[PDB]
Design a protein around this ligand. Structure first.
Ligand SMILES: CCCCCCCCCCCCCCCC(=O)O[C@H](COC(=O)CCCCCCC[C@@H](C)CCCCCCCCC)COP(=O)(O)O[C@H]1[C@H](O)[C@H](O)[C@H](O)[C@@H](O)[C@@H]1O
Lengths: 54, 55
């Protein structure tokens, strides 16, 4: 016998969308954090960059 | 003799007998049996599983 599910001539398909993974709720109990600092404000952390343009 | 043989054989073989369908492997849809799940089964919804080449 042939397996019940085979063959699909119609519905050509579509290009898969760009994957957008989600942060792990199971593996991480919370949200992973980067730079550590006192940050006596709403929160900036130990990482702050900037690009000075012309 | 029949009861003792039954008990002894069952106690001998029950150590070996294991349920193939005990949900053990974690998955986004809760723990599932081993045969259903492989390394490609997302442990949590939306997990990224790269097709890593094995150098
Ligand atoms: C005449 C005897 C009448 C009794 C029939 C016995 C068969 C019915 C079993 C009833 C118990 C099932 C419900 C509770 C139990 C349950 O859910 O367990 C299951 C597995 O059932 C077990 O326990 C062990 C099964 C017993 C072996 C029976 C051997 C064959 C018999 C029928 C032939 C000898 C009798 C004499 C006739 C021949 C005469 C000679 C001429 C699955 O295990 P699992 O959930 O994965 O956990 C694992 C743990 O079991 C596992 O021991 C442990 O070692 C782990 O590895 C673990 O992972």
């Amino acid at each position: 016998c042939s397996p019940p599910g085979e063959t699909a001539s119609s519905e050509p398909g579509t290009t898969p969308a760009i994957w957008t993974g989600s942060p792990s709720p199971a593996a991480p109990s919370g949200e992973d954090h980067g730079g550590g600092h006192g940050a006596g404000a709403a929160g900036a952390g130990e990482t702050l960059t900037a690009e000075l343009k012309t | 003799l029949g009861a003792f043989g039954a008990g002894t054989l069952v106690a001998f073989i029950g150590g070996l007998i294991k349920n193939p369908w005990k949900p053990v492997v974690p998955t986004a849809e809760g723990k599932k049996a081993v045969l259903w799940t492989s390394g490609w089964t997302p442990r949590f919804k939306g997990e990224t599983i790269y097709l890593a080449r094995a150098t």
